[PDB]
């Protein structure tokens, strides 16, 4: 079970509750030039 669809329509399906994907780099690091933590920022 849990992987059998009894309805042809795609909207008639269970929610995707077992997906884990992350990408925090979009907001935390938006700078064009790479910054190294050990090296001075400026």
């Amino acid at each position: 079970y849990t992987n059998i669809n009894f309805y042809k329509d795609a909207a008639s399906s269970a929610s995707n509750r077992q997906e884990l994907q992350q990408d925090p780099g979009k907001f935390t690091d938006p700078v064009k030039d790479l910054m190294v933590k050990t090296l001075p920022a400026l």
């Binding site: 329509d9 884990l20 690091d29």
Partner: protein, 269 residues
């Protein structure tokens, strides 16, 4: 379902490396870890960010509409314009993103109760209800026995009382590529008309009525609708709304306070 990062052992250090020092004017958030500034042991973390996902966060029913119709003029049926800006509980959650794509799974709860009168002796059979979704531009009924109720093309659901609540699924039915919760524009090209998100909201209406013709004494019913978004995708996170809502149509607000007042700067309760 991966776990969070583990902690790495550290020791005393004296060198020219400066992980702590940084510049906040660049617009970048520092990535310093606790091991970088302190001596830490090695621990294995099995904690998982499994319930912080958008799909799980939005995956729970919430009330969107409530109205009453009676069985004994225009009070025999209810009319609702499908919008998600009528209940504060779900409005605040869905205003954290600018654009969103999702598929709703609507359900309804219908209850009936006899009205208090001088004479209450009556025997009635079971009751049946009909719910009809009129597509945008379709004819709207004006009476309980109007001709629009025969749903040749429009969808309809019939639910006899005493059974399980009805449930239906609706796909992405937006003209654009996503649902625009916030729209900064005017309806007309001359910068006139209605300013707000009402222009882009073109969802149809909903009609509920009693199938039974009449009763010896008045009976009133209440319908509650719950929405659950699934297969959801979100874009452009937004800060949470601080001020309480005033009107459903617009985002007008009153001046409020950022945080609760404290006695002094160095006051620890």
């Amino acid at each position: 379902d991966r776990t969070v990062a583990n902690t790495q052992p550290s020791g005393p250090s004296n060198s020219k490396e400066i992980p702590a020092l940084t510049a906040v004017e660049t617009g970048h958030t520092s990535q310093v870890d606790p091991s970088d500034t302190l001596q830490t042991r090695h621990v294995v973390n099995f904690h998982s960010r499994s319930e912080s996902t958008v799909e799980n966060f939005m995956g729970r029913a919430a009330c969107v509409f409530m109205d009453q119709y009676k069985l004994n003029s225009t009070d025999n049926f209810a009319v609702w314009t499908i919008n998600v800006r009528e209940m504060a509980q779900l409005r605040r959650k869905c205003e954290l993103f600018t654009y969103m794509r999702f598929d709703i799974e609507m359900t309804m709860v219908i209850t009936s109760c006899q009205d208090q009168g001088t004479q209450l002796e009556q025997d009635m059979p079971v009751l049946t209800h009909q719910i009809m979704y009129v597509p945008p531009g379709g004819p709207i009924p004006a009476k309980v026995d109007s001709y629009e109720w025969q749903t040749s093309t429009n969808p309809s659901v019939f639910w006899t009382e005493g059974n399980a609540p009805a449930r239906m699924s609706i796909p992405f039915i937006s003209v654009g590529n996503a649902y625009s919760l916030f729209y900064d524009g005017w309806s007309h090209f001359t910068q006139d008309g209605t300013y707000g998100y009402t222009t882009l909201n073109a969802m149809g209406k909903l009609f509920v009525r009693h199938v039974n013709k009449s009763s010896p004494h008045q009976i009133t019913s209440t319908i509650r609708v719950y929405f659950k978004p699934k297969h959801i995708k979100a874009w452009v996170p937004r800060p949470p709304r601080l001020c309480p809502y005033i009107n459903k149509g617009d985002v007008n607000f009153v001046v409020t306070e950022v945080t609760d007042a404290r006695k002094s700067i160095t006051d620890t309760p």
